[PDB]
Amino acid sequence: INENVNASKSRIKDTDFAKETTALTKAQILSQASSSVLAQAKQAPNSALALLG
Amino acid sequence: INENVNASKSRIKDTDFAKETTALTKAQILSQASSSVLAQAKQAPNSALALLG
């Protein structure tokens, strides 16, 4: 019973490194990508002023 | 009667060394097999960590 309890006390509490790491990598790429979009968004006001000296 | 009751007081109490030895041997391979499986199941967590840097 105790062994099956320990098996039961996993995938409910104990994480799996397979899907956890991939979700982490997707999250890291998401943060890196979105932060790069910030850089391309800072220049929009610059063009919004360049037309008038 | 004493000779006969001594025969009756054997295979009731006295063990035959033939089948007892084989049962002892079978247990020895059983323990050795499980201990080797122990060392083999030790790295099951290790493989999970191997997929992350």
Identify all chain B residues contacting A16, using CB atoms and an 8 Å cutoff: 48
Pairwise CA distance, residues B52 & B45, whole Å: 12
Residues A23 and B51: beta-carbon distance below 8 Å:
no
- CB count in 10 Å sphere of residue A17: 15
Ramachandran angles phi, psi of A26, nearest 5°: -60, -40
SS3 content of chain A, % helix, strand, coil (to 5): 75, 0, 25
Residues A21 and B51: beta-carbon distance below 8 Å:
yes
Closest chain B C-alpha to A5 CA, distance in angstroms: 19
**Both tokens assigned to B53:** 């840097």
Ramachandran angles phi, psi of A48, nearest 5°: -70, -10
Identify all chain A residues contacting B48, using CB atoms and an 8 Å cutoff: 16-18
Ramachandran angles phi, psi of B43, nearest 5°: -90, 5
Closest chain B C-alpha to A44 CA, distance in angstroms: 38
